[PDB]
Structures are given as structure tokens and as C-alpha cells.
Curated annotation (Swiss-Prot):
One example of a Gene Ontology biological process annotation: negative regulation of defense response
Native source species: Arabidopsis thaliana (Mouse-ear cress)
Subunit-structure text: Monomer.
Membrane spanning residue stretches: none
Name assigned to this protein: Isochorismate synthase 1, chloroplastic
Cellular localization per UniProt: Plastid, Chloroplast
Gene Ontology CC annotation, any one: plastid
Induction per the UniProt record: By pathogen infection. Systemic induction during systemic acquired resistance (SAR). Not induced by light.
Main subcellular location: plastid
Enzyme Commission number(s): 5.4.4.2
The protein's annotated pathway: Siderophore biosynthesis; salicylate biosynthesis
Entry note: thermal dependence: Optimum temperature is 23 degrees Celsius. 90% of maximal activity from 4 to 37 degrees Celsius.
NCBIfam families for this protein: isochor_syn
């Protein structure tokens, strides 16, 4: 492929364009027609020294993108993204993509230095408002200045990629697409790109089985935590005095745990993700797997931001109490959350901090509601949606730079929290609690990379979770909460 960060981001490409083929009925037909479209393009090519050409075949059937991805060979990077069902909740910004899978890279974007405005421009060079589905999938480290552990090395400080071949799932139809990207200045010519693409296309599988199985077929040989429970309690104790004494301004710090599971045979991360998706309501599903890397997957409720043209939306998601088995206990826990003066104050400093980030960029911000409880499968959180209008679409980078990270995954004051995390946590968060999603021309959307796992062949998996330590947090209670948060992974692996 080619690293678009190496490109001349101030010089526009020769073209960025989408070509739609006649619709077919099945994925096997789509794969054959797409092979033919790439061939025809090779024989009647564009002649620019740089460009992006997306060729897409509509499929009349509704096919799950994760089922298509499951059928594919290990052609990396592997991408997956499915936005939230957003059931019943208002869309404050007042054909839609249900899921997308990608294999290979038409162009990728990676650096060891933090994602910068120039990097954002480098990606924007490959997108266009008139090609809405040309999108770059990936994310950014929680802390792009932290020490990178080896398991996170392939991800860099950030990793994005336009798929070589992708499957788009819509409400009542689907689409197979392939993307040709090239830049002679980077010694990745149109002929290089077409040749790489034609090899991948002959490897694409149309045996798209509809998956059902609950058994992943792996035995867990051990489970250990970093930190262990014996190291965690003192760490939370240390944070709690910093908060309650008047030497440290700390009011909130999110402290995380890496739960390591060793398996005999390799976990299939796409199969695992597929099982979280059928059981995951109102959540983002994602996979990011750079070449030669473990697969970063997640099923997260939390939006960092969504942008549609000039409208930007984010949310404040903080505090955690468990769900209860009985209806009366569940409601009592919920009312406790909604009425506690302490929780109100702790949630407010999160909501108001995010509100003002948006307020610094948008003319005016809407907050709705001020405070409710968002109920998930095993936990429930306090919650608030915040939306604002950009003056210009190019302010997208400002949104991203202002919001990541919010106090929901880092803390307050940000400076003192971020450095306590650096000193207390002995593992690399990597892209856990980092932005994960995609850039597009007129639309971009990023989840917060929580409720996620790193899945490594020949090893097993790292399962991540954190909790907000605030005045009055109970170490035993928070430890139990970390177990509840990773429970969607630990149950389904069995
Ligand atoms: C840190 C994440 O949880 C986050 C921290 C919130 C809290 O303060 O409890 C709850 C929702 C998330 O924003 C995680 O689940 O790993
Ligand atoms: Mg807490």
C-alpha cells in the first residue's frame, strides 16, 4: 500500500471519485462483477499521477458485513465498524450504513508521533463530499506520548486505512466495493495499486455463511489481572487520599485493569465480535487489525463524537452502578444514581467539561437531557447528550483534538489525572479508551475505545476496563465493577 501521511497534503489528488456498477442479486455476482470492473478500469484507466477511485456494486440482498468478513482470508489490515442502533434516543442533530467490513489497504495513515492537524489533512486529501462512502477507518492511542508496549507497536500513535475491498451493509440491501488509491510521488503507482487489488480480488470469498454459533471453541487456560487485586487496592487507596486531602487537586481519576486470558487455540476475533454484536444493543462494534498485529475489537456504548456536515454530537457518560436481577432492585439502584447529590456533582464536572470543549468551537451547544441513566446489559451510567453546530466543516479536527480524551476515561484535573495514570498503571492502554471509528468527507464518527480487547494469535487476549475513582469510591466495589464491565467478553469465551 502507501502511507498517505508521507504525501503532499497541500496538493490535491488528481481525482477522488466513486463509480457505481449495475446492481446484482448476490455476493458471488457482486464479487465477479467487481473483478470485471477493476479489469475494465485497468484497460481504460485514469491518467492522473494521483487519485482515489472507488468502484462499488450494489447487492439487492441484506447481508451482514460481519458475516462477509468472517468468510475472508486474513488479508490485513482488517477493519470493522457498526454504529449504534440508537433505539428511541433523540438524534440531537435535528440510506444509512448499518455495518462495514474491510480487508487490505488502498492507503493507510500511521506515525509514531501523535496525530496532528497535518495528519488529519493528509487523510482529508483522500476523501470527498461527493463520495460519501470513501472513508478511512482506524483510531488513536489513549495517550499518544506514552511508552508503546510491544503488543501495541503495530498501531503506532494512530492507525487509519481505506480498505482495499469492503462490504457495506445497509438497512435493506448491501454493497461490495473496492478502492484504488495511488500517488506516483510515493512510488505507489496506479499500476501498482491495480495489481495489488486484482490479487486481493481473486482471493475474496463469496461463501458468506450466516453465522449462529455461541461456542468459540477455545478453552481458557488461565486468567490474570494487571494489576492483581492485591496491587489494585493500594493504588485506589493512593488515589483516594490524593482526592480527599488538600495537597492534590485531583477530583477524578480513571484507573484501568488489563485482564489477560491465555487460550490453548487461537481466538477468532471476528467470531467473538460477531457474538457480541447479536447480543449488543445500542453499541458500537469495531475491529482494527493492522498488518501482522493482534486484533483490537470492542463493543462500546460510548460515542466520542459524530459529525454530519456542520452538526457535531457528543455525550457525557460517567458513573457506574450494576444492573440488578430483580426489577425492584434495578429501579432502586437507578433512582440512587439519579438522586445522589454526590453523583450529581461528579457527573456534572464531566458533562460541563465536555460541554465547554464543544462551546469553544461551536456557536452554541445543546444539552439534552441534563442527566438520565443509560441502562446497558450489566451496568448503568449517568448520561447526557451534547450537540453543537460548527462554523465550517474543517473544524472537525478541532473537535477531535478538544474532546479526546474526556474526563470519562482520564479525569480531573486532566493534567494531574493523566500523570497519575502514567505512574500507577504498569501496562500500556494502547488504543483502549482511545478514539475508534472513521473519517469521511461529509460524515465522521468516533466511538471511545472502551469495552474492548486485544486478541493475539498464539497467546489469547487482553481485556480492558476502567472505573472513575472519585471521593468516596470503594476499592472492593470498583474491582467488582471492572469484572462486570469485561463480563461481555469473559462470559462469551466460556
Ligand atoms: C473507563 C470506562 O468506563 C467509563 C467511566 C465511567 C465511570 O466513571 O464509571 C462509566 C462509563 C465510561 O465512560 C471503561 O468501561 O473501561
Ligand atoms: Mg466509580
Amino acid at each position: 500500500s502507501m502511507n498517505g501521511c508521507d504525501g503532499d497534503f497541500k496538493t490535491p489528488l488528481g481525482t477522488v471519485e466513486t463509480r457505481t456498477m449495475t446492481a446484482v442479486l448476490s455476493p458471488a455476482a457482486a464479487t465477479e462483477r467487481l473483478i470485471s470492473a477493476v479489469s475494465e478500469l485497468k484497460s481504460q484507466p485514469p491518467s492522473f499521477s494521483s487519485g482515489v477511485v472507488r468502484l462499488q456494486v450494489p447487492i439487492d440482498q441484506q447481508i451482514g458485513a460481519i458475516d462477509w468478513l468472517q468468510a475472508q482470508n486474513e488479508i490485513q489490515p482488517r477493519c470493522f465498524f457498526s454504529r449504534r442502533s440508537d433505539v428511541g434516543r433523540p438524534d440531537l442533530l435535528l440510506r444509512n450504513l448499518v455495518s462495514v467490513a474491510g480487508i487490505g489497504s488502498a492507503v493507510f495513515f500511521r506515525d509514531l508521533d501523535p496525530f496532528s492537524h497535518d495528519d488529519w489533512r493528509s487523510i482529508r486529501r483522500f476523501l470527498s463530499s461527493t463520495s460519501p462512502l470513501i472513508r478511512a477507518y482506524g483510531g488513536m492511542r489513549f495517550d499518544p506520548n506514552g511508552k508503546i508496549a510491544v503488543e501495541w507497536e503495530p498501531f503506532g500513535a494512530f492507525y487509519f486505512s481505506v480498505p482495499q475491498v469492503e462490504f457495506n451493509e445497509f438497512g435493506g440491501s448491501s454493497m461490495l466495493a473496492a478502492t484504488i488509491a495511488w500517488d506516483d510521488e510515493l512510488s505507489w503507482t496506479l499500476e501498482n495499486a491495480i495489481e495489488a487489488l486484482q490479487e486481493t480480488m481473486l482471493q475474496v470469498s463469496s461463501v458468506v455463511m450466516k453465522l449462529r454459533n455461541r461456542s468459540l471453541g477455545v478453552s481458557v487456560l488461565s486468567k490474570n489481572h494487571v494489576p492483581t487485586k492485591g496491587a489494585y487496592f493500594p493504588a485506589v487507596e493512593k488515589a483516594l487520599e490524593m482526592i480527599n486531602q488538600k495537597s492534590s487537586p485531583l477530583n477524578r481519576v480513571v484507573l484501568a485493569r488489563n485482564s489477560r486470558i491465555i487460550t490453548d487455540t487461537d481466538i477468532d476475533p471476528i467470531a467473538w465480535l460477531a457474538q457480541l454484536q447479536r447480543e449488543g444493543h445500542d453499541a458500537y462494534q469495531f475491529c482494527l487489525q493492522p498488518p501482522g498485529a493482534p486484533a483490537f475489537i470492542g463493543n462500546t456504548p460510548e460515542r466520542l463524537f459524530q459529525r454530519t456536515q456542520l452538526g457535531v454530537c457528543s455525550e457525557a457518560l460517567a458513573a457506574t452502578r450494576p444492573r440488578a436481577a430483580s426489577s425492584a432492585r434495578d429501579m432502586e439502584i437507578e433512582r440512587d444514581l439519579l438522586t445522589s447529590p454526590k453523583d450529581d456533582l461528579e457527573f456534572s464536572i464531566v458533562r460541563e467539561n465536555i460541554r465547554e470543549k464543544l462551546n469553544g468551537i461551536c456557536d452554541r451547544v445543546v444539552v439534552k437531557p441534563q442527566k438520565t441513566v443509560r441502562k446497558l446489559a450489566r451496568v448503568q451510567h449517568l448520561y447526557s447528550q451534547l450537540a453543537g453546530r460548527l462554523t465550517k466543516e474543517d473544524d472537525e479536527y478541532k473537535i477531535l483534538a478538544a474532546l479526546h480524551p474526556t474526563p470519562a476515561v482520564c479525569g480531573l484535573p486532566a493534567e494531574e489525572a493523566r500523570l497519575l495514570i502514567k505512574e500507577i498503571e504498569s501496562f500500556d492502554r494502547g488504543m483502549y479508551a482511545g478514539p475508534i471509528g472513521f473519517f469521511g468527507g461529509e460524515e465522521s464518527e468516533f466511538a471511545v475505545g472502551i469495552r474492548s480487547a486485544l486478541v493475539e494469535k498464539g497467546l489469547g487476549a487482553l481485556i480492558y476496563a476502567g472505573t472513575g475513582i472519585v471521593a468516596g469510591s470503594d476499592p472492593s466495589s470498583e474491582w467488582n465493577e471492572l469484572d462486570l464491565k469485561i463480563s461481555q467478553f469473559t462470559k462469551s469465551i466460556e
